[PDB]
Design a protein around this ligand. Structure first.
Ligand SMILES: Nc1nc2c(c(=O)[nH]1)N[C@H](CN(C=O)c1ccc(C(=O)N[C@@H](CCC(=O)O)C(=O)O)cc1)CN2
Ligand SMILES: Nc1nc2c(c(=O)[nH]1)N[C@H](CN(C=O)c1ccc(C(=O)N[C@@H](CCC(=O)O)C(=O)O)cc1)CN2
Ligand SMILES: Cc1cn([C@H]2C[C@H](O)[C@@H](COP(=O)(O)OP(=O)(O)O)O2)c(=O)[nH]c1=O
Ligand SMILES: Cc1cn([C@H]2C[C@H](O)[C@@H](COP(=O)(O)OP(=O)(O)O)O2)c(=O)[nH]c1=O
Lengths: 272, 272
C-alpha cells in the first residue's frame, strides 16, 4: 500500500553494492530510502560511501523516525551504527547481516575477535533483528576460512564479499516474505563490546607461535592501526611449520624472527 | 640396570598407574618414584604417591639419581618439574597432559578450556621434549565438557581418562613399539600461571554461555569458588529459557543471571 518498499541502512561496499543490486533488479529509486551511518561524510575512499551513492542516484536520505510508520517496509542493516527497538516499527520485516558465524562473535570488531581467539574460520549471517545485539533468528549463514596469514583487514574484505553475496542469495525470499529462520542456540554464543578490545594490543610472548602470530595479525588493518613491536609498525605476519627453537626473538632491519613456547617460526614484517 | 621405570608426579592417576605396573609388569625393586614437592605423604581428596610408594617399599628418588640409568622409562603423571632431556641417558621420557593437545599446553587445564568456551577436552600421552607439552603425540582420548560441568568435574574426568590411557598404552611403551606424530603448529595454545587470576572477576557484558562458563571454570572447592557479591558459588546451571537481557537478581540461596542474549543462569550459593 505504501510507496516506500525498502530501507538500506549502514555503510561501505556491502551497503552500496546491495543497494545497487536492488535498484537494478527489484525496486525503482523512488521506492527506496537509505540511512547512512553518522560518520558517513559522502566521500569515496577505501570503501564506497552509501551517502554518496544515494545522492548521486537520487535515493532519499531518511532517519529511523521517518520509517517507523511505514507499514510493511523491508529494513536492512548492513554495517549500520544504531541499535534498533523493534516496538518502534510497524513493520516486522527487519534484517541485519552480521559479520561473524553466529552464534559466535556477536558485537563488535569481528575482523579482530575471531583471529585473536584462534579461529580457523568465520562467516556472515543474515538474521532477523530482535531487541538484543545480533541475537535474532538466523535466516542464512555462509562460513569461509580465515587463512593462516590473513590479517583483520583481509578478513574484513572477505566479510564484505560474502555478505554482499548472502544478501543477493536471500533478498528474493525476503521480498516475498517466504524466508525461513531458526532461533540461535545458547551454546557457543559469544559477544564482544568495544570495552573488551584494546586496539593498542600489548603482545604476550609467553604463548605459542600460533597465538603470537594471531595476536599480531588480528590488529593489522592499516587504515585504523598496525601493531607495534620494538617501536616498529608491523604490516604482515607469516607463520610457518618450521621449528627454529623455543622463544626466539630477533630484530632485523626489515622484519622480526619470532617463535613462542612451541618454537615455530614467525616472520613479522616491518612496514618500513 | 635393575630399575626399569620411574613414576613421577601425584594424585590418583600416578598412584593407580603405579599400582597397575606393580600388579602386571614390574616388581617394587624394578621401580622408582619421584613425588611432587608438595606431597604430604598422607591421603586427602587424592591419594598420596609418596605414601603409596613407601607403603610398598618402592624407593623415593630425585631426578639427579635417575639421569644415568640406561633405558629407564620416565613417566610424568602430573609432575611438577620441567625436565631437560639431555640430562638423561634414556630417551624413553613420557608425559600424560590433561588436554586435547595441541590446545591448552601449560597449566590449569581444568580451567582454561571452560573459560575459553570449549565443548570438549581430552587427555594426551606424548614424548617429553624440551618444550612444555610440545612433544610428539602417542595417543589421545577426547571427551565432552558437559554444559554444567565445573573445573572440578573436568579434573576428575582427566584423572579417570588419564589413568585409562596410561593402561591402554603402557605395554607398547615398555616394548618400545609405540608410534607417534609431531604436533601441528595450528591450533596450538598455551597458558602459564600469570595468565589466570584464580580470583576471577566476572565480566557480565557477555553472553549467558560466557558468563556461566566464567563461573563454572573456577568452581573447584578444594582450591576456590568464584564469588558474586560476597557469596561463594558452588554450581552454575545454564538453560535455554529466555528471561530477558542482562538480568541480575540475588536471592537467599542463588542468583538469577542472564547476559546479552538473555538465557537463564542459576548460580547456586554454597550452603555453608
Ligand atoms: N536491536 C538490534 N539492533 C541492531 C542489530 C541487532 O541485531 N539488534 N544489528 C545491528 C547491530 N549493530 C551493528 O551491526 C550495532 C550498532 C550499534 C551498536 C552500539 O551502540 N554498540 C556499543 C553499545 C554501547 C553500550 O551498550 O554500552 C558498544 O559495543 O559499545 C551496537 C551494534 C544494527 N542494529
Ligand atoms: N621438558 C618438559 N618437561 C615436562 C613436560 C614436558 O612436556 N616437557 N611435561 C610435564 C610438564 N609439567 C606438568 O605437567 C610442568 C611442570 C612444571 C612447570 C612449570 O614450572 N611451570 C611454570 C613455567 C615457567 C616458565 O616456563 O616460564 C609456570 O606456568 O609458571 C611446567 C610444566 C612434566 N615435565
Ligand atoms: C574502528 C576500528 C576498526 N577496526 C577494524 C576491525 C573491525 O572489524 C573493522 C570494521 O570496523 P567497524 O565498521 O568500525 O566496526 P565493527 O567491526 O565493530 O563493525 O575495522 C580496527 O582495526 N581498528 C579500529 O579502530
Ligand atoms: C592450584 C590451583 C588449581 N586449580 C585447579 C586447576 C588445575 O587444573 C587443577 C590441578 O592443579 P595443579 O595440579 O596445581 O595445576 P595444573 O592444572 O597446572 O596441573 O586444579 C584451581 O582451581 N585452583 C588452584 O589454586
Amino acid at each position: 500500500g505504501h510507496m516506500i518498499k525498502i530501507c538500506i541502512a549502514g555503510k561501505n561496499n556491502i551497503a552500496v553494492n546491495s543497494l545497487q543490486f536492488i535498484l537494478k533488479n527489484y525496486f525503482e529509486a523512488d521506492q527506496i530510502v537509505v540511512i547512512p551511518n553518522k560518520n558517513d561524510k559522502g566521500i569515496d575512499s577505501w570503501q564506497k560511501s552509501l551517502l554518496k551513492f544515494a545522492l548521486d542516484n537520487n535515493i532519499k536520505i531518511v532517519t529511523l523516525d521517518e520509517i517507523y510508520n511505514i507499514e510493511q517496509i523491508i529494513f536492512f542493516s548492513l554495517e549500520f551504527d544504531q541499535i534498533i527497538k523493534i516496538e518502534n516499527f510497524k513493520s516486522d520485516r527487519l534484517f541485519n547481516i552480521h559479520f561473524s558465524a553466529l552464534p559466535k562473535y556477536k558485537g563488535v570488531f569481528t575482523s579482530i575477535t575471531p583471529i585473536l581467539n584462534n579461529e580457523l574460520e568465520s562467516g556472515v549471517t543474515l538474521h532477523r533483528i530482535d531487541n538484543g545485539i545480533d541475537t535474532g533468528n538466523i535466516i542464512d549463514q555462509h562460513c569461509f576460512p580465515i587463512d593462516i596469514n590473513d590479517t583483520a583487514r583481509d578478513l574484513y574484505f572477505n566479510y564484505l564479499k560474502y555478505g554482499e553475496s548472502i544478501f543477493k542469495k536471500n533478498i528474493q525470499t525476503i521480498i516475498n516474505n517466504s524466508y525461513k529462520d531458526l532461533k540461535q542456540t545458547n551454546i557457543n554464543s559469544s559477544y564482544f563490546s568495544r570495552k573488551d578490545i584494546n586496539l593498542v594490543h600489548k603482545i604476550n610472548f609467553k604463548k605459542t607461535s600460533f597465538e603470537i602470530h594471531n595476536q599480531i595479525r588480528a590488529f593489522i588493518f592499516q587504515e585504523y592501526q598496525l601493531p607495534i613491536i620494538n617501536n616498529s609498525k608491523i604490516i604482515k605476519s607469516i607463520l610457518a611449520n618450521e621449528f627454529i627453537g623455543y622463544n626466539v626473538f630477533e630484530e632485523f632491519e626489515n622484519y622480526f624472527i619470532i617463535s613462542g613456547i612451541d618454537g615455530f617460526k614467525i616472520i613479522a614484517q616491518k612496514l618500513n
